[PDB]
Ligand binder design. Structure first.
Ligand code: HEM
Ligand code: HEM
Ligand code: NA
Lengths: 717, 717
């Protein structure tokens, strides 16, 4: 296996195939962003005429282009699938995927077999992107196209928020271990899906339209649908509503032999201008179009919202049959309803058809009773579908503060992990300063304070922008019993103490100024850091931005927050069972979810060790003589060639480091020692380990600490 | 075959193995740099105490550490090998490798077979880096430790320049296609080494120390020595000076069998802390050290400069033997010189040895002539080694303005491609205005003025920082005769006119203001771009930094400049024969060498095309109807779905774009069409092709043009 020039993908991974890849800590570099550092997309979208935009999208939807002719003269349904697939890569195990970065226009998603024909779909929208320019991201435009198509065709959606900022480089995400398109190496037992995957095969959105592994058993397919949709945050009602609403519109495309469909866009030749799946069957487009291979028109009104889907589904009995491309699909028994389903280009009427996965909605007991109801109550269908469609298209949006434009309903939605609004006034400097002092007198150790503060804010993941310290959800279930949060010890005692100063400041409130318990957690860790820095000769002040609000168990979907629990957090030297990769890979992964740079992770790890942030106050990595002092000691001692490291006898994944006398002087995890072993981390360590580095380490530690405290704070930026 | 987590190296390269890798246009991104944005290494080293730095380095050289005890109680020889290997990766074909970025501390170079034991060498100097911190780069220290080692042991070096800026991410370089260490797949013809390479095997600095492919034949080895050292800028005299002066010091290491040496640093377990090649042979170090597996001590004075090496080489007859690890070496015949050679740790005394490649200096007719002369006149050896070591340790520093500190010698060196000092007052704003207008009245076209300026300035490559518009070498051999600069017609016409303008301005200037030819070439293109921006309805002024001076032919080494000749320049739609990859990979490589970002690269192609910069003024990519006009027409038309693109029937690497009538409207190359085809590049094209994009396009194109004109201008930086 030969080596390639860098410009062809060659590099150090070819020589050391499973080495730590720090490039996950500089995804989307700024060198590669064509917009200024000063580019402010929020400011840009504020200026967008949404009616004009909707109109222009309306014109695109009904102007057929010769190079991909519009089914029934309306691109609407294509655009809805496009939007549904854009959002449809989301997964709750890491919150990756989804439509929020517009990743569908980049590798690999732009070439997934399930995203076939969406190269022409996105391409049709260029006249729009061309007219609105920097005021409209592709990311906004792709889902807003779907939303408009829904409206254009008779369905009133719940609303839309703009604000997805375009990126310039594909998000690097694990979609599975299979090196084959459509491959399946992800299951175990009886249909246990490999975490963190939410699809049944490589390059599928959710499930196989011909049933699992091509076996068109609607009862079996429902097992997959239920499971994959639940990993994309949709329960049974949401799932059934979404499918019915989706397949109320448009058509599948499978007019001929699929071996006449050329390479996917990333592999296609240059003259195809980013498009792929060029096809030699017929005209290759329109009446001859091939996409999935299936040939199904679910309803007789493919460009109108009505209840056809559930009437056809229940009004006929279903025979297994074959598309013109050898794909399993269902059609009506007894030749019933001949010629009732209209042809996309004026040809003869056809018979009713369904997908294997559509019949699941009628065969599976839980789905059957949900959809039978909607057969006699379409207003309920229309309602649960709007709520679910809105949720689908905004899952990765983050806190509601991020939603932009004139189309965001004010209504509270529990799935957004809602936070009460700032009601009273906000603590100013004098007040802030005071409360640092009381917190310092609380009797809470720097270890207690810092570790609790880190526990709240570090709950944030930049993938879907959930979690974080706003909400005060650390004192609520489930966060309060998380083994990493070690409720066992002082989580309660710190919670209980910290609410006391909430009251004491509030019960003796000067006027209208109040403090949330969510803020005291963050102010606590802040003030402790100030203390531990003065203990080390440095008088400094840690920034603190108020405005967080408390929140009740009632506004905290316990099972939704389950997925935000760390199975590992190197910054506290915690490693639970079940992790997919050694502890140093989980370190980097956690830092990527925290939006941290490689230098930021480094200074954070070093700082937190010497402060006591370790899970169960363990000594691993605590390379300092001093107690609760803010030194660069961790870096200095890591570089001390006087220490010899050897794996612990007990196979803990612990190491001992001995001095000259052979006495054990230090212990550490793999997480600790990777900074001395990895050639690129040790470079950073050596920056912060030098004689002239103590003030810079502190300065950089604070700025990165303040960065984690502020991760979820879109209300103030 | 299996897909891996991005943190373990997964990505889109795995699905599309030979795809363009735009990550080459954001090497070493700011987010991964731990210093602030205000950091200026030049400012920091400028204030180092060199005298104290030297004493501390001398202190380390004579202070043996138990984990790698010092041969003869002196690390000096080990540090010379380290400096020579750091600089020794340099190759002329593309200017890459060398010591300039301190890449030896990063993969793959820190794990090269030829760099075994250097892991400990670099480790030994942490006490020096630790002490000076951000005043002293690893790059500067690594090569300075070797220079200090030389003077410590009796050799007065010529001087030394600080200024190598440390990096944080391995420079990705093509070192060959061999996926096996020490593999050889790089010769065709009769012993022709593949370009750009300059080593005979993968992970060698230059040549195999046991002769070609381990055939210990001095005469044949010599042919490799000659050719690799030539591709590293060293002629016969410099090469022999280097090998003699080098092996005047220290010893090789092979006390035991080589399969007792553990994995190289990047494959070594965490506890080894970046050190590799753990040896289970004896103590694994010191008297037992195994680096190369050869066990030669050259001189009887390993820690002192003298003429012992050539005295030993010529005072004995040599015969082939095996080291304790079974490697080929030579030893004296007839048990002569037994015991005359000291052991590194106490030791019984041993008899003369040389490497096969050392005998080449005596067996090869050219080298023998040189080395005999120095046997009889060793003062001459001292001089040539001083010049050649200085060249070696500084070959990639770039212009002499980058050399910092009190040890920088003042003499001009032809190999530095020198440039005259500014002799007069430089042009101010009024002179620059007047001269711009004189250029616009001259008769030279926008096309001629932009082409000339681009040809001069784009000769810079940021690898070794050679070339550029300063020096005015576009009017000298060889640049004036390069095919891409197409001297059959306009270039000499252009040169004459700018000289006439320079003469007439200088002979009438105010006070003592004078202007160089070199400045007028760049000024000319700046003036052309303002005129064309105006024709497109923009009133921009293109910045301009005076202060280039005019080299003479005598200060211009014709042969040394040959490696700078472009065999591909996508910015001019030029593609010669003999490039390693297709045209679009060469475009990126050219952008990389110019230090351009993907957005900067995209804006320049767009601008250069409509401006007329194309080699031979061909229409490929000239997607505009306007002459001499700086519009964004290239991106607008590239994105025009009304054009249909097919490969030209003449199979000539061009393409035809037809509109609706079926008439050929545009033509283009792989370089043009890759901006409409690559999904990352098309994203950038969509920014600059929007309706609102045209002022942003002019602004960024001007900024990138300015960056390119100033690439070599370290005299103002
Ligand atoms: C178990 C869940 C689902 C399965 C198995 C599935 C599968 C499919 C398949 C195979 C096609 C054929 C594509 C082609 O050949 O053109 C299709 C089309 C379509 N899908 Fe679904 N999908 C699912 C869920 C959804 C959802 C949740 C939505 C929207 C909320 C949706 C909206 C659409 C639309 C509008 C089309 C027609 C596109 C057009 O007319 O060109 N689907 N679906
Ligand atoms: C034909 C080119 C050369 C070859 C084949 C060659 C080969 C070698 C080899 C095999 C070693 C022993 C490695 C070990 O086990 O430690 C060695 C050592 C050394 N080489 Fe070279 N070398 C060459 C040129 C140079 C040059 C240009 C220099 C410096 C100017 C140099 C300086 C040294 C030094 C100082 C050592 C001593 C290492 C120590 O004392 O620890 N060599 N060389
Ligand atoms: Na319908």
């Amino acid at each position: 296996g030969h080596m390639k020039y860098p410009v062809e993908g060659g590099g150090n991974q070819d020589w050391w195939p499973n080495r730590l890849n720090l490039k996950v800590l500089h995804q989307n570099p700024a060198v590669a962003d064509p917009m200024g550092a000063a580019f402010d997309y929020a400011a840009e979208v504020a200026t967008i005429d949404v009616d004009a935009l909707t109109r222009d999208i309306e014109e695109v939807m009904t102007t057929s282009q010769p190079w991909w002719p519009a089914d029934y003269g309306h691109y609407g349904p294509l655009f809805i699938r496009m939007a549904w697939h854009a959002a449809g890569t989301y997964r709750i195990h890491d919150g990756r995927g989804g439509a929020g970065g517009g990743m569908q226009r980049f590798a690999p998603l732009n070439s997934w077999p399930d995203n076939a024909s969406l190269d022409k779909a996105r391409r049709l929208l260029w006249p729009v992107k061309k007219k609105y320019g920097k005021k409209l991201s592709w990311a906004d435009l792709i889902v807003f196209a779907g939303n408009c198509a829904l409206e254009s065709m008779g369905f009133k959606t719940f609303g839309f928020g703009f604000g997805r900022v375009d990126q310039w480089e594909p998000d690097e995400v694990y979609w599975g271990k299979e090196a084959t398109w459509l491959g399946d190496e992800r299951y175990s037992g009886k249909r246990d899906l490999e975490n963190p995957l939410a699809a049944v095969q490589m390059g599928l959105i959710y499930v196989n339209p011909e049933g699992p592994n091509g076996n068109p058993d609607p009862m079996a397919a429902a097992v997959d649908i239920r499971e994959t949709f639940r990993r994309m945050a949709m329960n049974d009602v949401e799932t059934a509503a979404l499918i019915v609403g989706g397949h109320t519109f448009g058509k599948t495309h499978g007019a001929g032999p699929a071996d006449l469909v050329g390479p996917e866009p990333e592999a296609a030749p240059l003259e195809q201008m980013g498009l792929g799946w060029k096809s030699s069957y017929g005209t290759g487009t329109g009446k001859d179009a091939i996409t999935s291979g299936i040939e199904v028109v679910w309803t007789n009104t493919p460009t109108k919202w009505d209840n056809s889907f559930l009437e056809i589904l229940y009004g006929y009995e279903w025979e297994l049959t074959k598309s013109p491309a050898g794909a399993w699909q269902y059609t009506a028994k007894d030749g019933a309803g001949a010629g009732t389903i209209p042809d996309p280009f004026g040809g003869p009427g056809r018979s009713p058809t369904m997908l294997a996965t559509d019949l699941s909605l009628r065969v599976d007991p839980i789905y059957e009773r949900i959809t039978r109801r909607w057969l006699e109550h379409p207003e309920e269908l229309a309602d649960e579908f709007a709520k679910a469609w809105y949720k689908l298209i905004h899952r990765d949006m983050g806190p509601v503060a991020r939603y932009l434009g004139p189309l965001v309903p004010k209504q509270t939605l529990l799935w957004q992990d809602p936070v009460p609004a700032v009601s009273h006034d906000l603590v100013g400097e004098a007040e802030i300063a005071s409360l640092k002092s009381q917190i310092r007198a609380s009797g809470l150790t720097v270890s207690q304070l810092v570790s609790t503060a880190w526990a709240a804010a570090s709950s944030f993941r930049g993938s879907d922008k959930r979690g974080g310290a706003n909400g005060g959800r650390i004192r609520l279930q489930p966060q309060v019993g998380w083994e990493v949060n070690d409720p066992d010890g002082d989580l309660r005692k710190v919670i209980r103490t910290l609410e006391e100063i909430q009251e004491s400041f509030n019960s003796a409130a000067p006027g209208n100024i109040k403090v949330s318990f969510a803020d005291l957690v963050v102010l606590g860790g802040c003030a402790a850091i100030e203390k531990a820095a003065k203990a080390a000769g440095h008088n400094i002040t840690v920034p603190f931005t108020p405005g967080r609000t408390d929140a009740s168990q009632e506004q905290t979907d316990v099972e939704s927050f389950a997925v935000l629990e760390p199975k590992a957090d190197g910054f506290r030297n915690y490693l639970g069972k079940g992790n997919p990769l050694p502890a140093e890979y989980m370190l980097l992964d956690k830092a990527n979810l925290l939006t941290l740079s490689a230098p930021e992770m480094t200074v954070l790890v070093g700082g937190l060790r010497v402060l006591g942030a370790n899970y169960k106050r363990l000594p691993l990595g605590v390379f300092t003589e001093a107690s609760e002092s803010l030194t660069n000691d961790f870096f200095v001692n890591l570089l001390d060639m006087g220490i010899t490291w050897e794996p612990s006898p007990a196979d803990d994944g612990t190491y001992q480091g001995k001095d000259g006398s052979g006495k054990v002087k230090w212990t550490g995890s793999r997480v600790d020692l990777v900074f001395g072993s990895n050639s690129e981390l040790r470079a950073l360590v050596e920056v912060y380990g030098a004689d002239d580095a103590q003030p810079k380490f502190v300065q950089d530690f604070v700025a990165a600490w303040d960065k984690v405290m502020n991760l979820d704070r879109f209300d103030v930026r």
